[PDB]
């Protein structure tokens, strides 16, 4: 029959208690008998039926008297499924007296009852007193419930919103909350809204990328780099000790042509726009949260305190943060070194280096999870909410360092403080500092970013869910037991599933927002990943996991401080990326200052001769001040080689010292940082302050009273 009510009875179930008989020592059987007797004496129904599939396992089912449900609903501030009170029974309109109450709310009430009972229930399950304890789903998602009376909410919800065939359809948040709970509803609403404006972000990013694409022909510096008469004649200095000869500059046409796309004014405009996009996202999210708070039953007060089975060292945690950053940096460096120590070839080398780094990061993720779990366990938090808050902070910090250490190293600490060939810098001793090509390391940063984002999202989602679905696709293209048994055969989501999904989404948000200057197409990947992830989460939650008790919440949780922190960090990170990682500022300075007779020779501002007039000159006879073993010995009759640094030429009164152009460029970079930082923060403050005159609709809705 697979009925939802009591067998041959008119009564609705809200939990199943399952145990293993001690008869295959009697201590466990006696303890369970005492616990069950206490539970029965407290005033709850019970019934035990043997499972046909397994004789050892015997399941126990419960019920819910109407009087107890009403009394406990009136116990705390609960509105219609305005505190409830039996003295005001007829005040609320009723369609039916025996089934009107939402089954989700009934399940939550009985969950509270079980939590308060002691012999306990949670510890009994943990220690093996009960094998499991869970509520029941409405029906099988495969087909409509046999019981015609049942609404079959699971089937309708699955077909409408969980199956991929409804990928394009809108999110039915009302059924989601009325079935699962407020936590799932708010999570999915936030995800949908996030995708909603990621659409606009992706459109703007695509516009900027296309604008960069249509300007390949006019990208003068790349053309000069390619022209053999200009690029080929320039002979660059060696970049390493033993595994590099003098190399012509024009070997980088592909690199320069690809870099000119991601190093144009379009990226600057996109970063500036994202600066205000972040604050618009925040402010509209507060508007939407207020609207949901008004429309939903989210004005119910929270318990003063809560129970937990479990009732300085902060420095030790920070030392682990430093070690995590260091180990990430060496992981990336070693990967690139080993791959290099053997059109497409160099690009493929970078791709495989990034792939290896991403793999190492993926393995390190599990170790970071485990160490965070033990370290937070050692603290013995007094309550639960603080436990989730501590997990959020510590896990977010570990993931942040583990996933952004390599990106930050590439953006800032690669080629920034390498001395001239005469006196190279060995920071740690016998460990030379890496230096980028004349264009810069922005393209490498973009490659690392895209590889990490793709790999993470794709591998995670695919490997975790798509297996049965891909099997079904392959098949298409190329006895019965009651509900409790089937539900038991499922697996539970634990207690951190929503936490893990939020962690994924926050790492995704950090990737899309922090380093947006390097990769303007990141929001498009964000949009695709979220469009898939929403349905992936819905399908997995409604198919492969046991039903979870609903909970009450008004905000996403502890992640909003991380949102604001990420925004304030992203503005400065983008400013520094544009200033230092990109070479836009030096070329603008050259255009406006070093193409005029005092320094240049052209009759008007132009980009001509930027490559020739910017590269420095080095003399081999001054190979080192120490006059020790050298790589420049022999290797042809070359006399002068050029390097990517702003320094005076040989023979100058200030030999191999930073020249006027260096300081002009540094001043321009710092001025850009200051102006962009100040303007962006001023605009963000103004936009936030413009709430009353822009989004007054929901505030008026609240003021309806």
Interface pattern 217-246 for ligand NAG (x via CB under 6 A)? ---------x-x---x--------------
Q: Is the dihedral of CA 384, 388, 391, 397 positive or negative?
A: negative
CA distances from 16 to 33, 39, 48, 127 (A): 16, 13, 10, 18
Binding partner selected for residue 537 from Ca ion, ligand NAG, its own copies, none, CB under the kind-specific 5 to 8 Å limit: Ca ion
Rounded Cα gap, residues 51 and 73, in angstroms: 34
Rounded Cα gap, residues 28 and 583, in angstroms: 72
Q: Work out which of 663, 679, 696, 701 binds its own copies, going by CB under 8 A.
A: 663
Size of the site for its own copies (CB under 8 A): 17
| Closest CB 346 distance from its own copies, rounded Å | 34
Binding positions for Ca(2+):
464, 501, 504
* Helix or strand run (H / E) with residue 57: strand 57-61
Rounded Cα gap, residues 614 and 85, in angstroms: 81
Residue 345 engages its own copies in binding (rule: CB under 8 A): no
Nearer of residues 598 and 636 to its own copies, judged by Cβ: 598
For residue 151, give the DSSP letter.
Answer: -
Rounded Cα gap, residues 385 and 442, in angstroms: 42
Size of the site for ligand NAG (CB under 6 A): 15
Binding partner selected for residue 671 from its own copies, Ca ion, ligand NAG, none, CB under the kind-specific 5 to 8 Å limit: its own copies
The answer for residues whose C-beta is within 8 angstroms of residue 586's C-beta and 6 or more apart is 614, 665, 668
Beta-bridge mates of residue 48: 60
Residue 671 engages its own copies in binding (rule: CB under 8 A): yes
| Closest CB 212 distance from ligand NAG, rounded Å | 22
Rounded Cα gap, residues 482 and 53, in angstroms: 11
Q: Work out which of 172, 422, 454, 650 binds ligand NAG, going by CB under 6 A.
A: 650
Residue 501 engages Ca ion in binding (rule: CB under 5 A): yes
- Residues 627-646 close enough to bind ligand NAG by CB under 6 A: 639-640
Cβ atoms within 10 Å of 40's Cβ, excluding its own? 11
Nearer of residues 196 and 460 to Ca ion, judged by Cβ: 460
Q: Work out which of 251, 269, 334, 362 binds ligand NAG, going by CB under 6 A.
A: 251
Provide the greatest CA pair distance for the chain: 103
The answer for residues whose C-beta is within 8 angstroms of residue 227's C-beta and 6 or more apart is 250
Rounded Cα gap, residues 511 and 507, in angstroms: 6
DSSP helix/strand/coil, 134: strand
Rounded Cα gap, residues 413 and 421, in angstroms: 18
Residue 660 engages its own copies in binding (rule: CB under 8 A): yes
Residue 690 engages its own copies in binding (rule: CB under 8 A): no
Residue 673 engages its own copies in binding (rule: CB under 8 A): yes
| Closest CB 649 distance from ligand NAG, rounded Å | 6
Per the CB < 8 A criterion, the answer to whether 108 and 549 are in contact is yes
Residue 702 engages its own copies in binding (rule: CB under 8 A): no
Interface pattern 545-584 for its own copies (x via CB under 8 A)? ---------------------------x------------
Residue 346 engages ligand NAG in binding (rule: CB under 6 A): no
Residue 599 engages its own copies in binding (rule: CB under 8 A): yes
Rounded Cα gap, residues 148 and 128, in angstroms: 38
Q: Which residues bind Ca ion (CB under 5 A)?
A: 460-461, 501, 533, 537
Q: Which residues bind its own copies (CB under 8 A)?
A: 572, 598-599, 653-654, 657, 659-660, 663-664, 666-667, 670-671, 673-674, 678
Q: Which residues bind ligand NAG (CB under 6 A)?
A: 226, 228, 232, 248, 250-251, 253, 612, 617, 619, 621-622, 639-640, 650
């Amino acid at each position: 029959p697979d009925s939802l009510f009591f067998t041959d009875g008119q009564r609705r179930i809200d939990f199943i208690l399952v145990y293993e008989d001690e008869s295959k020592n009697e201590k466990q059987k006696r303890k369970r008998q005492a616990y069950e007797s206490n539970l029965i004496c407290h005033g709850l129904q019970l019934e035990a039926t043997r499972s046909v599939s397994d004789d050892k396992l015997v399941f126990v089912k419960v019920h819910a008297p109407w009087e107890v449900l009403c009394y406990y609903a009136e116990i705390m501030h609960i509105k219609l499924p305005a505190p409830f009170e039996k003295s005001r029974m007829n005040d609320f309109y009723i369609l039916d007296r025996d089934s009107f109450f939402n089954p989700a709310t009934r399940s939550r009430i009985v969950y509270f009852i079980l939590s308060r009972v002691k012999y306990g229930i949670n510890r009994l399950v943990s220690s093996g007193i009960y094998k499991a304890a869970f509520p029941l789903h409405d029906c099988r998602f495969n087909y409509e419930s046999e019981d015609i009376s049942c609404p079959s909410e699971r089937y309708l919800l699955y077909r409408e919103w969980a199956h991929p065939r409804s990928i394009y359809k809108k999110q039915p948040l009302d059924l989601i909350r009325k079935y699962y709970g407020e936590k799932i509803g708010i999570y999915f609403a936030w995800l949908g809204y996030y995708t909603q404006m990621l659409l606009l972000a992706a459109v703007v990013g695509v516009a900027c990328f296309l604008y960069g694409y249509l300007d390949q022909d006019n990208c003068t510096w790349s053309k000069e780099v390619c022209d053999p008469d200009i690029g080929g004649q320039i002979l660059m200095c060696p970049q390493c000790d033993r595994l590099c000869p003098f190399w012509r500059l024009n070997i980088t046409c592909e690199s320069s042509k690809k870099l000119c796309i991601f190093d144009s004014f379009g990226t600057l405009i996109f970063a500036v726009f994202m600066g205000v996009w972040v604050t618009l996202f925040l402010e509209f999210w507060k508007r939407r949260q207020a609207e949901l708070e008004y429309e939903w039953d989210t004005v119910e007060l929270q318990q003063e305190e809560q129970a937990r089975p479990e009732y300085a060292s902060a420095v030790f945690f920070w030392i682990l943060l430093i070690i995590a950053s260091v180990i990430g940096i060496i992981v990336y460096r070693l990967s690139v070194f080993i791959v290099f120590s053997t059109l497409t070839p160099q690009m493929a080398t970078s791709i495989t280096a990034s792939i290896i780094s991403f793999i190492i990061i993926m393995i390190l993720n599990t170790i970071y999870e485990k160490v965070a779990i033990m370290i937070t366990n050692f603290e013995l938090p007094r309550t639960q909410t603080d436990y989730e808050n501590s997990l959020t902070m510590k896990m977010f910090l570990f993931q942040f360092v583990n996933y952004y250490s390599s990106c930050f190293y590439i953006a800032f600490f690669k080629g920034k403080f390498v001395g001239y060939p005469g006196d190279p810098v060995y920071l740690l001793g016998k460990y030379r500092s890496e230096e980028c090509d004349p264009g810069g390391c922005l393209l490498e940063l973009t490659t690392q970013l895209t590889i990490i984002m793709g790999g993470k999202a794709i591998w995670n989602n695919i490997q975790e869910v798509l297996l049965p679905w891909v099997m079904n696709l392959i098949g298409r293209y190329k006895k019965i037991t009651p509900r409790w048994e089937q539900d038991y055969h499922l697996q539970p989501m634990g207690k951190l599933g929503l936490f893990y999904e939020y962690l994924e989404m926050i790492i995704q948000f950090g990737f899309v927002t922090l380093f947006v200057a390097s990769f303007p197409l990141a929001p498009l990947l964000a949009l695709v990943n979220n469009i898939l992830e929403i349905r992936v989460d819905a399908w997995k939650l409604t198919t492969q996991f046991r039903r979870m008790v609903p909970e009450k919440a008004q905000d996403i949780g502890a992640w909003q401080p991380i949102m604001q922190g990420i925004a304030i960090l992203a503005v400065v990170t983008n400013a520094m990326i544009i200033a230092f990682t990109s070479d836009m500022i030096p070329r603008l300075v050259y255009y406006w200052s070093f193409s005029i007779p005092p320094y240049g020779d052209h009759t008007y501002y132009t980009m001509d001769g930027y490559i020739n007039n910017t590269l420095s000159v080095f003399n081999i006879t001054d190979f080192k001040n120490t006059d020790k073993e050298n790589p420049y010995i022999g290797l042809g009759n070359y006399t002068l080689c050029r390097y990517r640094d702003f320094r005076n030429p040989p023979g100058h009164p200030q030999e191999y010292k930073h020249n006027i152009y260096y300081w002009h460029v540094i001043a321009a970079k710092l001025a850009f940082i200051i102006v962009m930082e100040h303007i962006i923060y001023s605009v963000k403050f103004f936009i936030s302050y413009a709430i009353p005159d822009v989004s007054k609709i929901t505030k008026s809705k609240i003021k309806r009273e």
